[PDB]
Each structure stands twice: as C-alpha cells, then as structure tokens.
Design a protein around this ligand. Structure first.
Ligand SMILES: Cc1cc2nc3c(=O)[nH]c(=O)nc-3n(C[C@H](O)[C@H](O)[C@H](O)COP(=O)(O)OP(=O)(O)OC[C@H]3O[C@@H](n4cnc5c(N)ncnc54)[C@H](O)[C@@H]3O)c2cc1C
Ligand SMILES: Cc1cc2nc3c(=O)[nH]c(=O)nc-3n(C[C@H](O)[C@H](O)[C@H](O)COP(=O)(O)OP(=O)(O)OC[C@H]3O[C@@H](n4cnc5c(N)ncnc54)[C@H](O)[C@@H]3O)c2cc1C
Ligand SMILES: Cc1cc2nc3c(=O)[nH]c(=O)nc-3n(C[C@H](O)[C@H](O)[C@H](O)COP(=O)(O)OP(=O)(O)OC[C@H]3O[C@@H](n4cnc5c(N)ncnc54)[C@H](O)[C@@H]3O)c2cc1C
Lengths: 520, 518, 518
C-alpha cells in the first residue's frame, strides 16, 4: 500500500482526509516513554496533523486552488501545488512564491516544514536527473511521484551533535553509514539530528552533513529516501508543546502551541533496507561534494523559507501593534520607532523574495533557479532580524506579556472574572477578554516553550552563524559576483600610483602640496 | 546668463567642459576665511568639480548611452540621463535604476549628491504639476528645463541644528521665512543646514526643528540660483584641499577627488522671482507634499542604488585588504566578510523590489515600491555602522601599519624597509599592499571616511524619524490593515471556550486541571 | 650618554625640560620621506613631546605630589610616580590607580601610551626577577633604573600583519630573530608592528603571527635604546602636523597636541648588550611569561583607568554637544546619554574591583584582580564602538554644520552669519557652540578620532583573542571550577527518577501522563 493509493483520484494530490488516512500506517514513533498507536488521534500530534490536512484541503477549494495550483508537466492531466513542478521562468518562480505565501498564511507563518519545503527536492531531481548517473531513472520517477501526489517529505541531513570536533567517519557508532550491499537494496544504520515534523511525513530524504568534514570512508557518502513506515525507522520525539497546551492550557491560553507544533524528532535507522529504486548517491564522494552546487535543492528551498518567514513577520508586526494598543503605549515616539523597525525587517524578507524571482536565471533542461545571492542573504539576515524583533517585543510590550491570568478557566469563574473585567481591561475601551487574548497570542509566539523553540529554530535551522556567512561568501566568489565587484576596486586602484593620477581629468597636487616647503 | 546657455546644443545635457564653464559665475562661497574666486580652479573644489564633469561627459559616449540615456519626452528631439524623465512603468524604473548605478560606479559609490539625486525632484514636478495650483506652470517649466539640460540641483531642507526643542515658528532669527511679497517675486531670509556639494550646483530647492507651527510665512517651497544676490555658502573643512596640501592621491585616493563639501546655506534678503515659487504661505500643501509631491517617494531609489554601488566597492576592498594581511584563510574572518557580502546583496535586492513592485500614480507616472524605499532608509545606518566595525575588527593593525606618505616609497632609504617588512602576504609587493590598505583607510578612518559614516547614519533622518516614517508608510498604504486582517483571522478561530473552527480537536478529553485541583 | 644623565638630580625622575633634552640624541626617525632631525622641534612631534613633558613636570609640583608620587623602594632617598614601584597591597594598587588617573587627566584620556603604561613592565621585572634565571640581575637593574629615573619605555610585541596564516618560523624575512651571538651581546634583525609614540621614548622592550613555531632564534625578550645603530622608525601620517599645516588648535584641539604616532619599528643588525637581554632562545620562558611574568597581569589597570578618564571627558562632552543643539530636552536623547554614563561608570567600577580584589603574588608583590583586567579588555571595544555610534546618531548634523576654520570666525564678512545662524541653543554664543562641536568631532570623526576608534577596538588583541584570554583566566584561576561546582551541585539534586533531596515534592501524585497515554 503506497501512501498515495489513499487518493480517490490519481489526477490531484491528497485531500486532508486522504492525507490523514495515509499517516495510519506502520510508522514507529515514541513520546513520553510509549509508542504512539495512531499519530492522527494521539494528543501530542492530532492538531498539528489536522493543520497539515487543511493545507491539502486548500488545494481543492475554489477559494484557493487557482493561487495554489498548476497542471502537472507529466502528461497525467492532473494538478498540483505550484512549487511541486519545475519552474521554467522568472514568472513561474513569482507564481510559486505566491502559492507558498498562500499555504503559509494558513498557519500564520508558524509551520516551517510543510510539504512545499521538500517539494524543492522533488523539483531538483526533476530538473537535473542526469546528475545521478546510474540512478537517473530514480530521480525522474521520484520527481513524477512527488509532483502528482503532493507526497510529504522532510529531510534528516545534519548529524547528531556528538563529537563535532571529529570528521563524520570518526563517529562510526552514531552517524548514518552503509552496513551491507545486497541484491534487493542497501542496509543502513545510524541516526540524524531532529527531523522537524517527520512524525507527520510520508518519506524522509537522508543526506550527508555538509558543515562537518566527511572524511575518507565512502560508506558515509550516501543520499537516499526512506518511507516513514520502513521497518527499522524509528522516531524519538521531543516534548510536545501541543500535548502540554492541551493537558494544562487551552486554545485561548496557547493558541499557536495547540495547533502548529512541529515535533523535532530524533531520527533512528536500525538496519533499514533501502531498495535500489530509493538510492540517489551511492559511496560517491565526488557526487556528495558536487551536490550542494549542482543538485539544485540548496539553490531552491530558501525561496520557500524566506516567504514562510515573511508571512510570520506579517503576523508578528500586526500582533505587536495590537499588543501595544492593549497597553496604550503605541502613542509614544520611542514605541512607534521600535514598531517601525519591526515593519522594516518584515518588508526586507518580502523584498528578498521579490528579487529571488525577478533575478532568476536559466539552469539546465529549461529549468529556472531563484537569485542565489538573495537566498544566501535571507539565510544570513533571518537569525539577526528574528532575535532583534523578539527583543523589541519584550522591551516594548514589557509587563503586558506577564500581567495575565493563568487560564481561560479564570475568565469562566465569575468571582475571578469580575476583577479581570475591571483591572485587566484593555486600553481605550478594549474589553479584558480581547486584551488577554491578544497578549497570550503574542506570549505564545515568543515566550512559551513553543515560542522559545521557534527562536532556536529561526536562529539555527539553515546552519550555524559562521556557516551561513561562509556560504554567502562562497556564493559571491563561485558566481563571479566577487570578481565583478573586484573589477571596480581594481579600476579605482589603476587611476593613480605613487607619483599621482594616471587619469587626465584630475589635478595633481604639485601646485598645492606644502611638505617640501615645511620639511626641506 | 542661464547656466544651460553654456551648451553648444539645446538637444542634450551639458558636456563636462560646458558644466565647468557654467560654474564660473557670481556665486558667493567662503572657505578658510576667504572668498572662493572660482570653484573649478580652487584647491578645495577642483577635483570634486572634475569628478561631476566626468558624469556629464559619460552621457555623450556612444559606448555608455544605451545604459545612461533616453530621448526626452518634451518634443525637443534631444536626449537626457534616464532618471531626468518621468517613469511610466516598472521597466522604466528598472532602466533608471541601472542608469543611476552606471553613473555611481564613476565615483565608486562615494559621491552621494550627484545631479541624478535631485533629478527625482524635477520628475516629481513633471509627474504631478496640478498639485501646485496657481504654480502648476512653474512645475511644468522646471521639469522641462531640468530634463533637457541636466541642470544640477541640490536641496537645503533641514533646519540648522539650533533650538530643536522649539517649533519652526519660535526660532525666527534663524529658519527660512518670507519677509516681503512684491510684484517681481518674494524676499526670503534665513539659513538651512549643510547643503551637500551645493558649491558645484546650478540651483537649490529650498523647502520646509520638525514641528512647523502656526505662522504661514515659514510654509514655503521655491528654487534659487546659486548666483543670486544674498545666496551664499560657508564651507566646512575641505578633505580635498587637506589631502592635496599634506597628502597625495596614493595616500588619500577618495578624499582627493570625491569630497562633497557640506556647506552652510545662507539666504540674505534674496529675491525669488514668481517663476521660481512652488508652494506659497500654504500649510495645507506643505503638510500634503511629503505624501502627494512624489519626491519623498522617488529619491531613495537613487540613494539605495548609490549605497549598493559603494557596498560593491567596500566588499571587494575588504577581501583585497584581508588578502594583504593573509587572514582571509581563517573561518571567523571569512564569516565576517560573508556578512558584509549579505548586506551588500540586501541593498541591490531592495532596489530590485522597488522596481518590480512599482505602482501607477497620477498622469501615467509610476512610483517605486514605497515599503522598499522606507526599508532601505531604516537598514542603511545599521548596515553601514556594522560593516565599518567588521572592517576595523578584521583588518585591525593593517589599517595603521602604513608609512606616512608616497614620499616614503620615493625615498630608497625608507623604501628598502617597506619592501621587506611592509610587503603583502603570499607574493604581493609592498607598493600594492600599502595602496590597498590606504584606499580602505580613506574609505572609513580618514576625516572623509568619518564624514561618510556620519552621512550614511543620518542623511535621510534621525534613527527615530526613519523608523516612524517606515511605520507611517505601512499604516497609510493599507499594508498594516492587511497584516492585521491575518492576526484578526487567527484570533477569530478560538475563544475562552475552545476552537470556533471544526477541523481542530478541543482539549476537554485531555485537560487534567479539574482532576488535579479538587 | 645615558638619557637619565640629563637630570640635575639622581633623586627624582626627569623634569619636562630634561626629558625633552634627553630626546635630542642620534635617533633615526622618518616621516613624509625625510629624516626627522629633532623630535622636540619637528612639526609632526613637538606638541605630543610637550604634552609628555607636562606629565614629567607634574611630578615636581607640591600641589600634585601627594596624588602622583611616592618614595622609591631602592634606598636612593628619591621619589617617583607611584606606578613605577612594585605594589605590596590592595591599597598600594588603589593609590597607583589614582596616580594613573591624575596623569591621564592631563591629556583628557587621549594619550594611551604615556610612561606609566610600560612602568608596569619595570615593576614586573622588580617583583619577579628570579623568573629570568641567569638574566635575574638585568631584571633587578632595569627595575631600579626605570623606577628612579622615570625612563620612558614602549613595547613592540605584535608582529607585522604579513602572512598571518603562517607560524612565527615561516616568515623569517620579516619577524624579529637572533642572527649572531657574540661576547658583547646579541645581533638582532626584523620588524615589529606599530610602536605607538616610540619616537618620544627612551627605550623599547622587544618581545615575542601568534603561533611561535620550533626555531628558538625567535624566542627572545630584550631592551633596545632608541638611539642604537640599526634601530629606526618609519612614521605613519602625522595628525599633529596636518592639524598644524591646514587647521588650528580651535579646529583640531586633540589632534594638535595628543597625537601618538603609530610607527613601524625596524631593527637592522642591532647589537643588544647582554645587560639588556631578559629571555634568550628559551621557548619555555617565552610560553610561561604571559602567566608568570606579571606584565600581562598589570598593564590593563593603567589602560582601564586611562579609558575611564577618556569616558569622563566623552560623557560630559556629549552632554555639552546636546546642549548646543537643544535636543537634550528629549527622552530618547537623555536615554542614549544615560547609556554613555553607564559605560563610563563601568570602567571606573572595574578599576575599583581590580584593586579591592588584588592578591599576593611573589616576594610580597600584589597583583590586581585578573578577572577584572580580562573583563576591561573584552568590554572596551564594544563600549567604545557603541558610544561613538550613540554620539553620531544623537549629535547628528551638529557634527558637520560647522565652518571650515577659526579663520571664518576671524573674517567679519563670514562671522556675521555664524553669529546669527550657527549660535548655540538657549543663549550659547556661536564661538562656544562651534568650539564644543569641533572638540567632539576631533574626538570621533577627524583622522585622529578614526585612529582612536581603531586603537580602542584592537590595541590589546583581536576580538577572539581577548575573549579566549578571558576564558583562559577563568579556567587557569580555578574560577570556572568553582562555577562548575555549583552546576554539579544543582545536577546532583535530582535524577531520572525524581529529587534526590528530601525538601522537594516528587510529581508522582500530580503527573497525568500515564492516565493520558493508555
Ligand atoms: C529546532 C530545530 C529544527 C531542526 N530541524 C532540522 C531538520 O528537520 N533536519 C535537519 O537535517 N536538521 C535540522 N536541524 C539542524 C540545523 O540545521 C542545525 O542546527 C544547523 O545546521 C547548525 O548545525 P549544528 O546544530 O550541528 O551546529 P554546529 O555546526 O555544531 O555549530 C555549533 C557551534 O560549533 C561551531 N562549529 C561546529 N563545527 C565547527 C567546525 N568544523 N569548525 C569551527 N567551528 C565549528 C559553530 O561555528 C558554532 O559556534 C534543526 C535544528 C533546530 C534547532
Ligand atoms: C554629512 C551630512 C550631509 C547632509 N546633507 C544635507 C543636504 O544636502 N541637505 C539637507 O537639507 N540636509 C542635509 N543633511 C541633514 C540630514 O538630513 C539630517 O541630519 C537628518 O535629517 C537628521 O536631522 P537632524 O540633524 O536635525 O537631527 P535631529 O532631528 O535634531 O535628531 C537628533 C536627536 O534628537 C532627537 N530629536 C529631534 N527632534 C526631536 C523631537 N521633536 N522629539 C524627540 N526627539 C527628537 C532625535 O530623535 C535624535 O536622537 C546632512 C546631514 C549630514 C550628517
Ligand atoms: C592604533 C594601534 C596602535 C597599536 N600600538 C601597538 C604598540 O605600541 N605595540 C604593539 O606591539 N602593538 C601595537 N598594536 C597592535 C595591536 O596589539 C594588535 O593590532 C592586536 O593585538 C591585534 O593583533 P593583529 O593586528 O595582528 O590582528 P590579528 O591577530 O591578525 O587579527 C585579524 C583577524 O584575523 C583573525 N586571526 C588572526 N590570527 C588567527 C588565527 N591564528 N586563527 C584564527 N583567526 C585568526 C582574528 O580573529 C581577526 O579576525 C597597535 C594596534 C593599533 C590598531
């Protein structure tokens, strides 16, 4: 039973109901010391699963289908989310940018690992399948499959944060490695860092870590895909903000934690058989080193991430204004100036996504890639912008983020509520129910455990502070951008020497230099 | 004589030679306690004048006309710099963006007040002349004049930094005001804060301590020639003259040719003819001009591109400087340079968005994306201060381990030690190493570098003001209401009793609080 | 002739006049492609020399001797600056802190390499002479000599910024190395990075691209007179000369008297007598000197006080500058000035802690709190860059709305407009307003201001190195192990089954997970 066989039609991706049915499979997930029986009904995952299911439902609704979907390029006569099909122009990238924005708005920018994130991987396979050599047909088939079905992939690429001071092949007891080569496929074992929302995915792409030196053993030089229900695949979940908010809070108290929690799970592979049809790069140091620059994925996914963050910043910006209307401090110059800077950061990420599309270039086989410099720029700025925005919220909303009753239960008890109505009202006529609601929404965005995890995510998810900057420099150098900037500096330098100007339009200083007269 | 009458043709802007001749007028400029006889030959201005003259020469080069010029829209059959005529599409704005970049590369991004900066004012007059009421014909004529000739305007808008704690009605002894209304025109007196490069301009636009007040004699906008009686400039110290008198082009390569003197602008009982008046004793038009005039919604396109060109230069110069010292091999150094690259990329991406998201305005004119203009203004001071700190903390002693002068290289007694001990890393010779690092020092640490940091931090407004204007744009455009509609939708999806949407599970079956607090 | 033989008495340090006479020796200095005949009269050095001479004169003033001087500990019956003799208590360090502050106030915190900076080296030699083995007597003699005379030392320790990607063994064509061992002493050649104010010093201590390597010919520490054959300086541009040639004291008040020329130090086959050798072909002593020598554990007391004095000056000057513009009335401006006040307070509080937490070392000597020294080094670059940004973003156009020269005030034709339009706020006259703002600009934006920013950011090491050394101090002192004992205690108070301490309640009675996940 293929997960896409739950669809009532082969000419469209899953509906939300078919997607939920596709998750009631053999996946082996652990949380709070027990195996999850059904991820769609379990109290740690049911609402995050329902939230992803809503994205699938939106693909078929007349109210969103046109902004979200295109026909497939496969000859099936079907349709798919625009970002699941290879772009072949700058306008195609702009349409994909808008389709990503529309889906992201459904979670207010809070779900960062929705199916469109890894759809860029499906497109990378379809745009350049020749890169994979003997595995070219697997790349072509995987592109067709992902595009037609809307299959939900995530990736587990970063190695566990253990023995970082050593090359990947020197942490053999932990990192993903080839165990055995057989006729049916390859046996792999090891673990990857947290695989965000992988409990709700169909497949994971398992790839080599690029920020850590690989070494000299080719058994670590692998790229392949694994279904979430493959025997030996195990997820060990982190604490569930969804379950905690359900057990000890309410949607009113924790409105984001209760529906958008993407569990960052440890991914374990215990002697998993990967069929040859799922192998993409095999014991190949050459292809592993070339994949970041030639594969296309690294040159596609930040378009999705930049738009998703820009949507979250649309939400945070207006929510900060709403929060300041609660306290009444929005009337002050300093407060307005701080909110104005949040507006500037919000505007920045939308402008970067515009440039990604307008400056797009042809690649291979007619495929277009977004502006690579803009992708690297989003990665560098986002951690700085996010940390600054959170600090601005805390230093302006101040006590408004803590002057809040424990629970919706307090509002529902008239003995407590009578005091909340009088003493916890909003400024200028706003009732206490709305005031507490707005400020709890802001606190869940930045200070709840979910808010704290989101700050950790925005700071680190695409790489360390040094790595994102190194990659930004490498792009400038590899593209020829640095050589073009250097040609301008070399022109400036060529216009004079130790004797004076070499250009005839400027005046030498022989008639005005006073040093001989002063020193000789 | 009109400055444009120096042109041998009415079908093109000035050549560099005609531009220089046009500055040899009756202008009253002071520097170092003396009157400046001729800005084109004076040692404080001659090279900055020659640098601007090069921009005019570039307009007439066949290899550069495709990027720099377009036909006029006046019916003269002439041509002009692309940014001197009203944009009528997103593509027109992109071509203007490129024409600004091409001119800016001629000064490596260091001249921030070149003729294209105020060409946006000429275009604002041409795009919306109806805004000016009875002065509509002046707006139309000034647009035609600026466009055809390439007339060099600057503006003096910011009031002197005196009694900022008071409104623009309680400091009448200093600020620009109407003093007499006559048949020939208006008599004005007062001063404006530094008018950058105004010593080399043909005209200055004079426009309205933030809060204006209640006296309409201060509610003015008009044009003044640089050679009108009573118009005078009191110059600041000349980095060009100092670099010439005590340095050399090798030692101070930017100071020696790109210094834009920030002069105090004084108007002493100046007669402004009615043909030069645009807004007269009109608080309503003065308050509406920032949002309806167009200029405030056009010039940051020029300034963002000009900065992005300077960042192309600084980025590669930082790489060159780190190649000198050999520290470019280290991870931390590469990461810091990578961040400079990210800031450089940002300002180009903002200029892209300004053009692609452009909107129709009035009479077929297009305006760049307003949010992107406000974003450039907010980010630029932070990016510039951060980039300078990154250079200083990475190039470190390389910026000071330099001989005093090109005279040290030209003395073999000293040069023998420079050749051995002040060589560049991995085979680079000492002449090139010292040259690169002196170029970087002139960009950030010389008095010229220091002034450029003060300029990038402040020129479009105080830190609070640029942020306030960014917020106002979000509110006035409807952007804030659209972001708010998303927050209100999120809020509408639940209440104190649970979800109001049917796809989510209520917590009644899992909430343990009742069972826990008996 | 010995430089101290210029003194009319052996029982006190130099007077200013004797100090100036002592500099009129055979020193080989270059600037602007020419040999400097006499540093005391040359226009690039005369005022900086006069400024140092004033510090020596202050030692002999009865009104200042209580704060500045103590008896020598040598048995000579003489006196010296307090920081020139070994501290033997926390109170001795506090009195030295005050004596440093008093001398620093004479240059308003702008001279960072005055004779008291290297007096810490003289004290390090006197406190632990046994460290130097066979060179112990040289350490004792040098301590006595520096203490009694007030000899002016600087140090040249940092290698030229060339081939930083290589160790101090693979750049032999540049770095200081032993070339010959003889009966009279050692022959050395090489260069060091800028030796701040070395043109005005008597001697330089020469000491060991970070990683040293494996060749012991580079493992040296020794003293060299400024007039030894082969010792020479190649000066950087002179802010003093430039301010004199093209400015005035009114226009550049700090550049004109406190410029400490950052000179390239060259040693060409210099003979160093054995009496001047301290560490010889000894990797063991070179590696142990940073932790056992004492100097690295003494000089940041001088530097922290000197910066705190400069911050007293900058803080009040920022208030004065904001009184000029009138913006001091606004909340945001007052808040920014308040932060400058907080940074100024910090460096004084660090100097307090350096003294009160002082510890015994060897032979009765006391050392300031090592953690506070490392903290000053880490915070100072961040505080300085932030303070400069605060000044620029608040004083804004006040720093550029200034006439070129005192010559503008002395020309009534220009001065009439300065009096009206460049007056200060609320009654302050234009002469005082321009004077205050030019003083602030010379502090931060002139080439001297730019060099001072580069100095404060980098002089004690790169951003990573100062932080690494701060961490190493925490580890080596046992501070980190004591902080770790608290974290280990916290961890020991529970395990995977619950609390291990009896005062806390386990969650068995309230944990709902079993009941929820059936
Ligand atoms: C909430 C969250 C969700 C995530 N989801 C996913 C996911 O779905 N899939 C996935 O594959 N990954 C995921 N990640 C991992 C993420 O991509 C990484 O955290 C990021 O790439 C940084 O790598 P790292 O954690 O190994 O940090 P490191 O690379 O180990 O950096 C830590 C520190 O060590 C330094 N350092 C490390 N190596 C070196 C070196 N060789 N030389 C010098 N300094 C070095 C760094 O500069 C930094 O200061 C997620 C992370 C978070 C926080
Ligand atoms: C090198 C340089 C070149 C320039 N060239 C030109 C030019 O050619 N033409 C031109 O017209 N201008 C020019 N300017 C002026 C520039 O536009 C201004 O400096 C800028 O607009 C900031 O205004 P300001 O200097 O008056 O600072 P201010 O507005 O006075 O700000 C200083 C401080 O006071 C605070 N403040 C001021 N007013 C208030 C208030 N009402 N309420 C609360 N806080 C307040 C600010 O928040 C800030 O902290 C130039 C400036 C520089 C530095
Ligand atoms: C105005 C001024 C006056 C001075 N006066 C004196 C004086 O009188 N006497 C004196 O001896 N010195 C003096 N100095 C030198 C000063 O002490 C040094 O600049 C400081 O120690 C920093 O060392 P550096 O310049 O070699 O920088 P570097 O150490 O070369 O650092 C530059 C960059 O390279 C990186 N880097 C360097 N090496 C490594 C490495 N191995 N691994 C990783 N990254 C690395 C750093 O992290 C940094 O990002 C002065 C400096 C200045 C600016």
């Amino acid at each position: 039973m293929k997960p896409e066989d739950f669809r009532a039609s082969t000419q469209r991706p899953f509906t939300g109901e078919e997607y939920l049915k596709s998750l009631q499979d053999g996946r082996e997930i652990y949380i709070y010391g027990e195996r999850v029986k059904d991820v769609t009904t379990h109290p740690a995952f049911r609402n995050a699963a329902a939230s992803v299911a809503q994205l699938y439902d939106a693909l078929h609704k007349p109210e969103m289908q046109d902004s979200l979907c295109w026909n497939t390029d496969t000859g099936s006569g079907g349709y798919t989310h625009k970002f699941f099909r290879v772009a072949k122009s700058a306008d195609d990238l702009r349409q994909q940018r808008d389709a990503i924005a529309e889906w992201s708005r459904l979670s207010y920018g809070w779900m960062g690992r929705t199916p469109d994130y890894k759809a860029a991987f499906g497109c990378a396979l379809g745009a350049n399948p020749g890169f994979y050599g003997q595995f070219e047909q697997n790349a072509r088939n995987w592109y067709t499959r992902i595009q037609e079905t809307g299959l939900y992939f995530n990736h587990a690429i970063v190695n566990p944060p253990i023995d970082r001071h050593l090359p990947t092949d020197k942490v053999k007891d932990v990192y993903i490695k080839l165990e055995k080569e057989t006729d049916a496929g390859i046996i792999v074992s090891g673990a990857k860092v947290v695989a965000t929302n992988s409990a709700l995915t169909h497949y994971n792409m398992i790839g080599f870590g690029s920020a850590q030196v690989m070494g000299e053993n080719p058994d670590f030089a692998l790229m392949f895909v694994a279904p979430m229900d493959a025997d030996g695949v195990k997820l060990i979940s982190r604490a569930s903000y969804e379950m905690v908010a359900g057990a000890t809070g309410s949607p009113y108290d924790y409105p984001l934690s209760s529906r958008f929690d993407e569990n960052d799970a440890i991914l374990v592979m215990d002697n998993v058989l990967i069929p040859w049809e799922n192998v993409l790069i095999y014991r190949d140091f050459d292809r592993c080193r070339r994949w970041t620059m030639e594969g296309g994925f690294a040159r596609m996914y930040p378009l999705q991430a930049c738009v998703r963050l820009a949507v979250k910043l649309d939400f945070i910006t207006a929510l900060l204004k709403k929060s300041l209307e609660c306290t009444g401090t929005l009337e002050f110059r300093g407060v307005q100036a701080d909110l104005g800077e949040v507006v500037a950061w919000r505007n920045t990420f939308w402008a970067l996504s515009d440039s990604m599309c307008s400056e797009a270039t042809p690649w291979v086989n007619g495929a277009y890639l977004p502006d690579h410099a803009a992708l690297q720029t989003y990665r560098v700025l986002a951690p700085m912008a996010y940390a600054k925005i959170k600090n601005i919220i805390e230093r302006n909303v101040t006590s408004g983020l803590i002057y809040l009753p424990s629970s919706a239960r307090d509002l529902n008890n008239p003995q407590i509520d009578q005091y909340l109505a009088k003493y916890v009202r909003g400024s200028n006529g706003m009732d206490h129910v709305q005031r507490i609601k707005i400020l709890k929404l802001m606190w869940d965005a930045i200070g709840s455990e979910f808010g704290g995890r989101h700050e950790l995510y925005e700071i680190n998810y695409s790489g360390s502070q040094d790595e994102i900057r190194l990659q930004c420099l490498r792009q400038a150098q590899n593209s020829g951008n640095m050589d073009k900037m250097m040609a301008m500096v070399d022109r400036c330098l060529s216009e004079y020497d130790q004797d004076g100007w070499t250009v005839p339009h400027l005046h030498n200083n022989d008639d005005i230099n006073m040093l001989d007269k002063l020193l000789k």
